[PDB]
Design a protein around this ligand. Sequence first.
Ligand SMILES: *C(=O)c1cc(C[C@H](NC(C)=O)C(=O)N[C@H]2CCCCN(Cc3ccc(-c4ccccc4)cc3)C2=O)ccc1OP(=O)(O)O
Length: 106
Amino acid sequence: SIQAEEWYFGKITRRESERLLLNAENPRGTFLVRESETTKGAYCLSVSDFDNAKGLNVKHYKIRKLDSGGFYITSRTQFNSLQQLVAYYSKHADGLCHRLTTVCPT
Ligand SMILES: *C(=O)c1cc(C[C@H](NC(C)=O)C(=O)N[C@H]2CCCCN(Cc3ccc(-c4ccccc4)cc3)C2=O)ccc1OP(=O)(O)O
């Protein structure tokens, strides 16, 4: 159950995800998964990042879920569950601004 996941914030807004992620104490990769405001059946993986050009900032990636069961950000790299996807991206940055590190604090 995704709702059982501590990183699953469910129905929170994009502005709220940014308010929570834009905390100076959050290292790069602080993240949360929420429902997308625009795409029904898709979620957003909101991630914090930091660099000297943009300072602390947030990126939002769309996570799709197929009826065929896979979950993915890029269709070329799919997972049997949202949990597996989070685990994979916690170990590989790939196209993300940073690999997922810890759950965002409220
Ligand atoms: C959630 O569904 C959500 C997310 C988005 C996508 C956002 N849009 C906005 C308005 O911020 C977006 O454009 N994000 C960027 C993130 C940075 C990288 C550029 N990009 C395309 C891209 C390229 C490569 C990969 C990738 C990742 C891992 C491995 C391989 C490749 C991912 C993404 C983006 O997509 C829009 C809306 C939205 O719902 P809301 O509730 O409105 O926020």
